Design an enzyme around this catalytic site. Structure first.
Site, PDB file in Angstrom:
ATOM      1  N   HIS A  69       0.792  -1.222   0.000  1.00 31.93           N
ATOM      2  CA  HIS A  69       0.000   0.000   0.000  1.00 31.93           C
ATOM      3  C   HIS A  69       0.828   1.277   0.000  1.00 31.93           C
ATOM      4  O   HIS A  69       1.492   1.600   0.983  1.00 31.93           O
ATOM      5  CB  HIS A  69      -0.971   0.002   1.179  1.00 31.93           C
ATOM      6  CG  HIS A  69      -1.920   1.158   1.173  1.00 31.93           C
ATOM      7  ND1 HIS A  69      -3.151   1.110   0.550  1.00 31.93           N
ATOM      8  CD2 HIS A  69      -1.812   2.399   1.706  1.00 31.93           C
ATOM      9  CE1 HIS A  69      -3.762   2.270   0.709  1.00 31.93           C
ATOM     10  NE2 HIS A  69      -2.971   3.069   1.405  1.00 31.93           N
ATOM     11  N   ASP A 113      -1.750  -3.704   3.770  1.00 32.36           N
ATOM     12  CA  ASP A 113      -3.160  -3.482   3.458  1.00 32.36           C
ATOM     13  C   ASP A 113      -4.063  -4.050   4.540  1.00 32.36           C
ATOM     14  O   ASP A 113      -5.233  -3.674   4.644  1.00 32.36           O
ATOM     15  CB  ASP A 113      -3.529  -4.135   2.125  1.00 32.36           C
ATOM     16  CG  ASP A 113      -3.313  -3.217   0.956  1.00 32.36           C
ATOM     17  OD1 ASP A 113      -3.597  -2.010   1.113  1.00 32.36           O
ATOM     18  OD2 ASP A 113      -2.857  -3.699  -0.110  1.00 32.36           O
ATOM     19  N   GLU A 146       6.142 -12.953  24.389  1.00 30.15           N
ATOM     20  CA  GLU A 146       6.615 -14.324  24.235  1.00 30.15           C
ATOM     21  C   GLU A 146       5.508 -15.145  23.580  1.00 30.15           C
ATOM     22  O   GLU A 146       4.326 -14.833  23.727  1.00 30.15           O
ATOM     23  CB  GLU A 146       7.034 -14.930  25.583  1.00 30.15           C
ATOM     24  CG  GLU A 146       5.888 -15.499  26.416  1.00 30.15           C
ATOM     25  CD  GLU A 146       6.358 -16.131  27.723  1.00 30.15           C
ATOM     26  OE1 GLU A 146       5.726 -17.114  28.170  1.00 30.15           O
ATOM     27  OE2 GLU A 146       7.354 -15.644  28.306  1.00 30.15           O
ATOM     28  N   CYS A 182      18.192  -0.522  14.564  1.00 30.74           N
ATOM     29  CA  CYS A 182      18.292  -0.638  13.112  1.00 30.74           C
ATOM     30  C   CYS A 182      19.462  -1.515  12.619  1.00 30.74           C
ATOM     31  O   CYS A 182      19.614  -1.728  11.425  1.00 30.74           O
ATOM     32  CB  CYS A 182      18.345   0.751  12.462  1.00 30.74           C
ATOM     33  SG  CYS A 182      16.806   1.710  12.750  1.00 30.74           S
TER      34      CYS A 182
HETATM   35  C1  LIG Z   1      23.980   9.714   9.979  1.00 31.80           C
HETATM   36  C2  LIG Z   1      23.601   9.911  11.412  1.00 31.80           C
HETATM   37  C3  LIG Z   1      22.657   9.111  12.001  1.00 31.80           C
HETATM   38  C4  LIG Z   1      22.017   9.533  13.284  1.00 31.80           C
HETATM   39  C5  LIG Z   1      21.394   8.369  13.984  1.00 31.80           C
HETATM   40  C6  LIG Z   1      20.035   8.193  13.978  1.00 31.80           C
HETATM   41  C7  LIG Z   1      19.398   7.004  14.635  1.00 31.80           C
HETATM   42  C8  LIG Z   1      18.494   6.303  13.664  1.00 31.80           C
HETATM   43  C9  LIG Z   1      17.201   5.701  14.138  1.00 31.80           C
HETATM   44  O1  LIG Z   1      16.660   6.108  15.161  1.00 31.80           O
HETATM   45  C10 LIG Z   1      16.558   4.575  13.390  1.00 31.80           C
HETATM   46  O2  LIG Z   1      16.439   4.880  12.062  1.00 31.80           O
HETATM   47  C11 LIG Z   1      17.382   3.336  13.513  1.00 31.80           C
HETATM   48  C12 LIG Z   1      18.137   3.195  14.780  1.00 31.80           C
HETATM   49  N1  LIG Z   1      18.245   4.291  15.678  1.00 31.80           N
HETATM   50  O3  LIG Z   1      18.681   2.154  15.073  1.00 31.80           O
HETATM   51  C1  LIG Z   2       7.851 -28.980  32.649  1.00 30.10           C
HETATM   52  C2  LIG Z   2       6.954 -28.426  31.587  1.00 30.10           C
HETATM   53  C3  LIG Z   2       6.996 -27.096  31.261  1.00 30.10           C
HETATM   54  C4  LIG Z   2       5.871 -26.481  30.493  1.00 30.10           C
HETATM   55  C5  LIG Z   2       6.293 -25.200  29.851  1.00 30.10           C
HETATM   56  C6  LIG Z   2       5.900 -23.993  30.368  1.00 30.10           C
HETATM   57  C7  LIG Z   2       6.354 -22.698  29.764  1.00 30.10           C
HETATM   58  C8  LIG Z   2       6.966 -21.824  30.819  1.00 30.10           C
HETATM   59  C9  LIG Z   2       6.752 -20.337  30.785  1.00 30.10           C
HETATM   60  O1  LIG Z   2       5.786 -19.859  30.201  1.00 30.10           O
HETATM   61  C10 LIG Z   2       7.726 -19.406  31.437  1.00 30.10           C
HETATM   62  O2  LIG Z   2       7.969 -19.784  32.728  1.00 30.10           O
HETATM   63  C11 LIG Z   2       9.022 -19.412  30.695  1.00 30.10           C
HETATM   64  C12 LIG Z   2       8.923 -19.657  29.238  1.00 30.10           C
HETATM   65  N1  LIG Z   2       7.699 -20.098  28.665  1.00 30.10           N
HETATM   66  O3  LIG Z   2       9.876 -19.495  28.508  1.00 30.10           O
HETATM   67 MN   LIG Z   3      -3.991  -0.722  -0.604  1.00 33.39          MN
END
Ligand SMILES: C/C=C/C/C=C/CCC(=O)[C@@H](O)CC(N)=O
Ligand SMILES: C/C=C/C/C=C/CCC(=O)[C@@H](O)CC(N)=O
Ligand SMILES: [Mn+2]
Ligand SMILES: [Mn+2]
Ligand SMILES: [Mn+2]
Ligand SMILES: [Mn+2]
Ligand SMILES: [Xe]
Ligand SMILES: [Xe]
Ligand SMILES: [Xe]
Ligand SMILES: [Xe]
Lengths: 334, 334
Positions: free
Chosen positions: B25, B63, B104, B130
């Site tokens: 888009h 879109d 997560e 970035c």
């Molecule tokens: C050429 C100079 C660059 C100045 C730095 C700007 C930071 C840029 C941004 O904020 C994002 O585009 C990406 C990032 N910061 O990782």
């Molecule tokens: C022994 C079996 C475990 C079942 C799995 C559960 C997921 C656990 C969680 O949800 C968090 O504690 C950590 C994680 N998921 O990375």
């Molecule tokens: Mn469109």
């Protein structure tokens, strides 16, 4: 020419330093329930799910508006002292926490700025639910093993205060179901805390604990995830243990300590039983600290060290099952 | 025994496949202004900051309610086709996007589940504003170089739709200052899109482009960050270029293409002038696609390939300045 499991293990990576931070504020499940009681009664539930279902008696919270980067920074200062080295030695800092200051910059760059890293220091965050500290160790290990750097920091600060506040409010709401109430009770097993580890090329720290590396298996078919989660989790852990046998030469009985990420008491119970692990080799902090996410493993390892329940030559299993699903198992020889 | 810059370069890592997705888009800056005009007039600003200050004439949006994982998945399917390999070959999938489905599980595990990765596939997200796609390439490169895996996916999907919606609403609000209005105009340089790369051990893909690796320098003292940001950014890039000279043997004139992350037209202008770079060796998509964050670099590289402005032996500089501040510079030899 011929591959062997032991070939992919790191030969020159050690743990130079390790620290943890216990969050100061004890919140008992007793108190939380006193506040939930009018909703337990109101919902006709005589079940202390926290105390004798999840098995959590207390968890630690921060006393003030601590950011993940603040907690990670505090732990990192402590780990540097443990390793007896200045921040200028650090060539890599990885942050692995679930808790996150901002969308950008990385939490790692904030911690690095706080510590005063040199301009040569590489930084970034790794995100992988509860397993990320192990991922960060492994990533740092490969740079160390290769000689790109001499020292690395892996840090992780967790804050659950806002979650607990937002959660306690929705569960004491009038129009709340027993489903939602249950679907949110899980947030109340989380705890605060922090950990950091200094890793180093072994020759720079003779006689320090050795990090061998480990294995990962995944079941990303289940990324949508209940008893189903426990069953699939254990099945994944079974296959990861086969990989560990094939690479690390693991037999359950030859390991001296199991440092295991913990979800709840019955989860850990089911795991320990499934693998025939001696529960005495499994230190647990979940009852008084709750689930500190990816910081759980290094915090427990750090507590073992200071206690000090570790002796030179001890074979230490680091492991967890994380959302994904993923499962990782790595070895440290103290 | 004696270190040389070239020693830390990867010798057996190649790019097997590469693809990008252009979001469908087209939103012109013409249209955005038609909507902002009652706030430009109302604020007495005759400045088309977008068209001839930032230098953005259009940006692409999705879109529909495309999640980062959806866009990354689509790009990854395309990259696999480009590499002519099935998903079963993939031993590592890293997601590097700023956009994120959930807290997560990792966005990488979601993409992996969509693609149907095998149980041996390691996954996690890397977050570093970035620059993260380059970080992900480097992380995968070390596993490839070491032989832990044979093929890796690095993926990145970006969605700005919600940002644009939330932002366009706050800038057409009655009680809005010229400060806020300016402080938010920056969100309106962002664009949507996706990219994915299949990396592989060189011997498995003879004659494929080679990824040599690169260098990073940081100035995390400035993690709080204006003309100050441009000045510190260029200073950091200067020192990173010294590191590149020391490791990659870079001289500005010996490079055939510069694939550069872009913040705005005047930012890129200042950079190109500072380094004495021939602007003809700098493909730019910012004018019609805006800033696609960490996906910007691989998308531009992918467009160069298909165009196809690349020839075997071409030395290609990949680089960017990210929040942190961090700066990375890496080389691909086509
Ligand atoms: C050429 C100079 C660059 C100045 C730095 C700007 C930071 C840029 C941004 O904020 C994002 O585009 C990406 C990032 N910061 O990782
Ligand atoms: C022994 C079996 C475990 C079942 C799995 C559960 C997921 C656990 C969680 O949800 C968090 O504690 C950590 C994680 N998921 O990375
Ligand atoms: Mn469109
Ligand atoms: Mn207190
Ligand atoms: Mn020893
Ligand atoms: Mn060639
Ligand atoms: Xe240690
Ligand atoms: Xe185990
Ligand atoms: Xe390619
Ligand atoms: Xe450059």
């Amino acid at each position: 020419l011929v591959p062997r499991g032991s070939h992919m293990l790191f030969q020159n990576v050690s743990i130079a330093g390790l620290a943890h931070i216990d969050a100061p504020h004890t919140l008992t499940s007793k108190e939380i329930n006193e506040r939930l009681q009018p909703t337990y009664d109101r919902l006709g539930i005589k079940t202390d799910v926290l105390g004798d279902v999840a098995g959590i008696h207390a968890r630690r919270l921060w006393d003030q508006d601590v950011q993940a980067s603040d907690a990670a920074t505090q732990a990192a200062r402590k780990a540097l002292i443990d390793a007896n080295i200045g921040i200028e030695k650090i060539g890599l800092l990885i942050n692995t926490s679930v808790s996150r200051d901002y969308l950008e910059p990385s939490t790692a760059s904030i911690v690095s700025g706080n510590l005063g890293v040199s301009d040569h220091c590489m930084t970034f965050d790794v995100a992988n639910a509860c397993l990320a500290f192990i991922n960060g160790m492994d990533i740092a290990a490969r740079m160390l093993e290769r000689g790109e750097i001499d020292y690395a920091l892996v840090v992780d600060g967790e804050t659950a205060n806002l979650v607990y506040e937002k959660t306690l409010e929705r569960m004491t709401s009038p129009d709340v179901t027993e489903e939602e109430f249950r679907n949110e009770l899980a947030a109340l097993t989380l705890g605060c805390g922090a950990a950091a580890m200094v890793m180093a090329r072994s020759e720079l720290v003779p006689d320090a604990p050795r990090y061998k590396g480990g294995v990962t298996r995944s079941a990303t078919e289940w990324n949508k995830l209940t008893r189903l989660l426990l069953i699939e989790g254990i099945k994944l852990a079974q296959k990861t243990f086969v990989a560990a046998k094939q690479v690390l030469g693991w037999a359950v009985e030859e390991l001296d300590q199991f440092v295991i990420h913990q979800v709840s008491r019955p989860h850990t119970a089911a795991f320990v039983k499934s693998f025939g692990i001696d529960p005495a080799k499994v230190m647990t902090i979940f009852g008084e600290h709750g689930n500190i996410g990816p910081a759980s493993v290094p915090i427990v390892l750090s507590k073992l060290k200071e206690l000090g329940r570790l002796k030179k030559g001890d074979r230490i299993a680091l492991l967890g099952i994380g959302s994904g699903l993923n499962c990782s198992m790595a070895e440290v020889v103290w």
